[PDB]
Amino acid sequence: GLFGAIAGFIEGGWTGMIDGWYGYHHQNEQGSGYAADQKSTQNAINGITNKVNSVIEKMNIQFTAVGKEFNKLEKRMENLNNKVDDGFLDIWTYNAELLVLLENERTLDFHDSNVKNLYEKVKSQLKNNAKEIGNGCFEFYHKCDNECMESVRNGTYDY
Amino acid sequence: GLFGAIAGFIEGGWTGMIDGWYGYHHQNEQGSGYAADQKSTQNAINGITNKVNSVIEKMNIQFTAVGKEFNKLEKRMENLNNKVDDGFLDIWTYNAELLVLLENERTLDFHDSNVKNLYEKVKSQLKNNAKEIGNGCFEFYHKCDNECMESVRNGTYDYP
Amino acid sequence: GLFGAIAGFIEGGWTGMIDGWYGYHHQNEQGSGYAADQKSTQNAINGITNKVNSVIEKMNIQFTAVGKEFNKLEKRMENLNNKVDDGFLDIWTYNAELLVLLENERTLDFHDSNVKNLYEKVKSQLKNNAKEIGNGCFEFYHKCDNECMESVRNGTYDYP
Amino acid sequence: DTICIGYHANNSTDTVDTVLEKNVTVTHSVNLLEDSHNGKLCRLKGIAPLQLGKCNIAGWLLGNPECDPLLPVRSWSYIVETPNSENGICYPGDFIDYEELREQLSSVSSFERFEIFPKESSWPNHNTNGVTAACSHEGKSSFYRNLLWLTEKEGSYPKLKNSYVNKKGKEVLVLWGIHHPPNSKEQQNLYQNENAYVSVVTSNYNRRFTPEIAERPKVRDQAGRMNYYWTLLKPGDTIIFEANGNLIAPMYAFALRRGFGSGIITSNASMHECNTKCQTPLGAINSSLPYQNIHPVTIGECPKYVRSAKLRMVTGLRNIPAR
Amino acid sequence: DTICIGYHANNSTDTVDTVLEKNVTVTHSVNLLEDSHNGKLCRLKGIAPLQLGKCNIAGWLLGNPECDPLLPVRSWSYIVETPNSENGICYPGDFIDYEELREQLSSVSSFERFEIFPKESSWPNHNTNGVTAACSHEGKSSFYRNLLWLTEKEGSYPKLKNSYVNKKGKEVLVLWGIHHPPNSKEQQNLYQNENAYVSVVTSNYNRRFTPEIAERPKVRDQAGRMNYYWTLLKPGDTIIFEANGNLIAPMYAFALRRGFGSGIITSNASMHECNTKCQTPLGAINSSLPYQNIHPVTIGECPKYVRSAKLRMVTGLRNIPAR
Amino acid sequence: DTICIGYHANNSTDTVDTVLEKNVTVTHSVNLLEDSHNGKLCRLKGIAPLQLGKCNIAGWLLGNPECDPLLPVRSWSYIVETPNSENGICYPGDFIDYEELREQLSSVSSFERFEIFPKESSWPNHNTNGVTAACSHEGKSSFYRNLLWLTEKEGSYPKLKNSYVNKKGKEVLVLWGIHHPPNSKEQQNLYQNENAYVSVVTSNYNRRFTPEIAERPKVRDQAGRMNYYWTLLKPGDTIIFEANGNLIAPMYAFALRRGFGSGIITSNASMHECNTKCQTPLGAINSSLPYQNIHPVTIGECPKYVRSAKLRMVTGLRNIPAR
Numbered sequence A: 001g002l003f004g005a006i007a008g009f010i011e012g013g014w015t016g017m018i019d020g021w022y023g024y025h026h027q028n029e030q031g032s033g034y035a036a037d038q039k040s041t042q043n044a045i046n047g048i049t050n051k052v053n054s055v056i057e058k059m060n061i062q063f064t065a066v067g068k069e070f071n072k073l074e075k076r077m078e079n080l081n082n083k084v085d086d087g088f089l090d091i092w093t094y095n096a097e098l099l100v101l102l103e104n105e106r107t108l109d110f111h112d113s114n115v116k117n118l119y120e121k122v123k124s125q126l127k128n129n130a131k132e133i134g135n136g137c138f139e140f141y142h143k144c145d146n147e148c149m150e151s152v153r154n155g156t157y158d159y
Numbered sequence B, C: 001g002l003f004g005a006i007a008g009f010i011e012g013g014w015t016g017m018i019d020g021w022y023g024y025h026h027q028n029e030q031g032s033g034y035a036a037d038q039k040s041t042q043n044a045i046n047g048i049t050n051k052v053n054s055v056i057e058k059m060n061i062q063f064t065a066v067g068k069e070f071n072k073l074e075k076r077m078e079n080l081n082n083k084v085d086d087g088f089l090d091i092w093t094y095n096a097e098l099l100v101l102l103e104n105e106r107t108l109d110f111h112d113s114n115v116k117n118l119y120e121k122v123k124s125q126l127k128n129n130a131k132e133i134g135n136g137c138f139e140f141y142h143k144c145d146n147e148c149m150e151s152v153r154n155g156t157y158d159y160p
Numbered sequence D, E, F: 001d002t003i004c005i006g007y008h009a010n011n012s013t014d015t016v017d018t019v020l021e022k023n024v025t026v027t028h029s030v031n032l033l034e035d036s037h038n039g040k041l042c043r044l045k046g047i048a049p050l051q052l053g054k055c056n057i058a059g060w061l062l063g064n065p066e067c068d069p070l071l072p073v074r075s076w077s078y079i080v081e082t083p084n085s086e087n088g089i090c091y092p093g094d095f096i097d098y099e100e101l102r103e104q105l106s107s108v109s110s111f112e113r114f115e116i117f118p119k120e121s122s123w124p125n126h127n128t129n130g131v132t133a134a135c136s137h138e139g140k141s142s143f144y145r146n147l148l149w150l151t152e153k154e155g156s157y158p159k160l161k162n163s164y165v166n167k168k169g170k171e172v173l174v175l176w177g178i179h180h181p182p183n184s185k186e187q188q189n190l191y192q193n194e195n196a197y198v199s200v201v202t203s204n205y206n207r208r209f210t211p212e213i214a215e216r217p218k219v220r221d222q223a224g225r226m227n228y229y230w231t232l233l234k235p236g237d238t239i240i241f242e243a244n245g246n247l248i249a250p251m252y253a254f255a256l257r258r259g260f261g262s263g264i265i266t267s268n269a270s271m272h273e274c275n276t277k278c279q280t281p282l283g284a285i286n287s288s289l290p291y292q293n294i295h296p297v298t299i300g301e302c303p304k305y306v307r308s309a310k311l312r313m314v315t316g317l318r319n320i321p322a323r
């Protein structure tokens, strides 16, 4: 990835998490589990929903377009009409494929970035109260519970 | 933002800084005050100036273009001319709008990246002489008057 | 650069390294030298090679295209044909130049990113068995032979 | 105690292409390319198409006896021709500005077929029962339903002059023909005058027709030829027909009503009682996707045609089940 | 002692759209879409346009009496027709290849209107005072200023043959007409010769015209018709007119000079003493912006027309005053 | 002990442009714009083009004596005309639908020139030695190789009628002419009948021609004129010629074979024994790049033409020797 998180210092994903695209794991004390970070997932959802809607919106509806007939003495006109239809078709086919290719790359980097920023956000919150270990995981020192785990999720961790 | 600085760990902008896009804010015993980092601000300006100019340059000037008339027995030709004009217009409108949307996103990520890299540059200087407050600031372990603050602005400092 | 490494905290390139785009230097006791990271380098090659082939693939071949004659009473038709040809030429010229400009930028940032991640990747390994000096460089503490300098290249080191 | 930061994963097999890599499996994605359609020709916003079937526009407008089933149709949403639409003109000849007439009918939403020159009363001094095996029906010689073959009556073809004032409040499509005998003898017994002519005029149309006699290869067993012409008579205007021979006079004309979105397509698909907002020669499309690779010819409101086989945008992320 | 790294912010309310988020407030931005014009028609680089006013190209070149004010204009930067440009041909008829003539005039930067066939001395054996109420002027029957109506003199219309050699060193546009009476009586007392004809030839042009006599709906109170024709006479070439009736002879012709960047536009805007490099039918544009959404029709060097309502590029950063 | 992370650098001076910066020196890159050609006209996949040279399509198909070297050519990959292709029609006149004939020849891969009407046996009762200084050869008056000038034989011009049945199994291009004397005396001396006509008909073609006699400026030292016509005779159909004067009859016709990828180009480059898949008027191209700025006219499989002077895609990274 462009930001090094996904398929990076965080080797794989969690089929266990099903609430959003990004989230936390947490465990020990009262038990384990998964929890999606709504803040990040929603922002990401709004952004990507906008991207897709923009792509769609930019392509106005194609109104009636049909063939035309030319008599035997209008070959040049027939070929001109042909040059026009094929020319526009080439351009739109090119445009559509390139836009999708280019934006798909951008979307993936966007997610990579989101995971990365989320990781760094929790890190600057925990500081010395925990140690970076299992790539994406922080092992607490003061040992926190569940209400405390939530303060880490909603970003209010009282250092 | 993609790089997490703007509207990120550096939560807001300074309406108090008016010398550039990126800068510092010192708060020592001698006083406070803002100061734009010319190095970064200028590079950002050159890049964005070249970007805007490129967009403009690629759209060479439109020379005389007008309608044409067709007699009542040239309906197919009139429609061909119409298909041609609408077709090119659809493409250029799409092109112009898409290019602006895509590049505006890129410009914002650009600035974000500039603030991020600037922060990391200073962080690597104040490595072991101050502590990261967390939101773009650094508290020096010792004094830093004003002449010391400048050593930080011009990328020198040197005192690990 | 967008990611701060190339022409950033790692000032320049190594004309000495010729095995790949990204690599390590290493100046251990058994001697020194250069070594390129096959992993990242090869990975970058596959991406860029795919990019170039995509750009080329999308621009399928131009088949026979030639001028046309019009008699003296077909000026409108001749001008229509002219509008069509110039319009398609304007668009393709625009498309080609923009795509290349836009993707060249992306390519440079791609490399910047690869160097950046390779760096942080080694850093997260050494952790405390060395410090960060001239940026891009790490001064080992325990002193490791040309055998251990290798454990870093292949990413196994281990000794936080 | 531990807390890890991670990302979603699933069993999705969706794949997408990027600039740097092809076939990347992702958690969520959306397809933007429509590739599904009805067969089936449907009504367009409730209105049925005009199916010429074995007939083409010429056969329909002139009244080729093989196109009678089309005589009552007054309105349609689009016109459909088939690969077997071979019944056009039945008497050999040239249909002047035929492609332009087709283009005209393409923006016609409906019309009223009416007698512009009633067979009985319009031509008192001429015979009008002229028929031909070239336009046979039920195994018998017949003729166009909208035209009348005028010929000599009791050894004489008086100079005729008939006019019609357009009081329909719409453009009236008028069609007629000029017959060309293969030899002067035939020209004589059919129209009596050897140097005949036909004149047709309106406030904005002015044309004269002269018989061009010559032996010709047979077409549909006829050495003769019939050239067909048409004009659009503006509301309130008058059309005057004058001739002393060779005129295949108009009997029925059409009061046209203009509309938008119509067109002529060629399809071998069948008409069904379905409704759609987008119709192609292959079938109807019901979609909101921006693109389609079904067919470049479309009637209505449709996705833009592209030659692409696949256009999928990733929304989720790189799927890594970590299994 | 603290030092912080931050970014600029202000009170700008400029907004822009991005792929991921719409209406994003930024510190600095640049508009690339021109939406301003001065609702006036201006000179194009000092040269004034030709305003046909109530006349159209046809009325201008033929010499419609209602277009006399246009007679002296020799050069222009562009041609302007208005919604009320109704004065074209005043005697009813068909202007052959009219659209092509318009396209030819579109690359004409200036011309000299000269007498190709002086009224007094060109037609010694024919009358040249024929006029019509269809082309009246000052409530009195008149005729085109650039053409002459030739008719019988003293009971006879002698075969005429007159020619002109182009020594202007430029293409010369020649126009003429062919009159078509509604009946033989009129054909006879105007031209005497019942079966007349007109011939016009050059080294690269060759056409013959025959009167087509027939009763026609009256237009501008005339049952007659006049078809107008034109050709371009190359430098050094000769044009020959030969006729024994029905010829509406050329009196004035035009020696054309070609240029680039001109065209015909339709506008209801008024001419003012202003200068511009870019003119549209709505007004003149003075801008360096790449796009404009003002009008698709343009003359000169203009921004590219697009249907966009807004095209603003952001240069500054996301604006967060944080108040 | 120190270990550093760094990136490649070199001597390369390659530069590329990006959106933010211009002329970025990079380590590696690839050019995508083909700007090289071999300056020669080549065979296209082994087949040689047809070089009309000093002749143009008209001169070639009619058989202008100045184009005899072309008579034997039967196949070609593309047609080449030169800035000096001035030898077309030699007898002044108009070549009807000439541009369309050229378009027709653009998709012909080969044909067989054959005698449709053998000079002797086709016209027993007419003189066929008609010749003109306008079409001279070897400083001696001659005539088109593919046509025959028929004239009065012994003060008599019998009404002729000849037919040809197409049994070639391919389209047959038939060409002919109509001569137009400048005066009645000549018409009489050459064709006897004062009021002559020519009729040409097939199953889908039907045209009649009438001599139009008038004094005209001399072109190529002739006041007379010859108008040239053509038509495509479908496999199995029959073409009939009927006349009593003025016919410039067909002697040789062409059985056409259709192909794809051909076209007519104009070039001043020379033919060489080279082979290519892509030919431009300036020279052939041998390349796999997607674009070329050599020329917009192409034959075969070529790169896309663009007006760009440079299109280089960086592959390596920003080059910084750090010297």
Ligand SMILES: CC(=O)N[C@@H]1[C@@H](O)[C@H](O)[C@@H](CO)O[C@H]1O
Binding pocket: C147, C150, C151, C154, C155, C156
């Ligand atoms: C000790 C040493 O030489 N390092 C290698 C290392 O380069 C390689 O990646 C790893 C797995 O094959 O095996 C180690 O032995």
Ligand SMILES: CC(=O)N[C@@H]1[C@@H](O)[C@H](O)[C@@H](CO)O[C@H]1O
Binding pocket: E010, E011, E012
């Ligand atoms: C003079 C004027 O137009 N007023 C604006 C003011 O509204 C704005 O708050 C300030 C800072 O952006 O800039 C001023 O120029």
Ligand SMILES: CC(=O)N[C@@H]1[C@@H](O)[C@H](O)[C@@H](CO)O[C@H]1O
Binding pocket: F022, F023
């Ligand atoms: C005209 C010329 O010599 N070419 C250079 C060109 O290589 C460079 O891209 C451009 C931008 O600095 O400046 C031009 O002067």
Ligand SMILES: CC(=O)N[C@@H]1[C@@H](O)[C@H](O)[C@@H](CO)O[C@H]1O
Binding pocket: F286
């Ligand atoms: C790359 C190379 O070897 N050059 C040849 C070139 O000499 C030849 O004219 C052309 C025709 O096929 O093919 C190229 O591959």
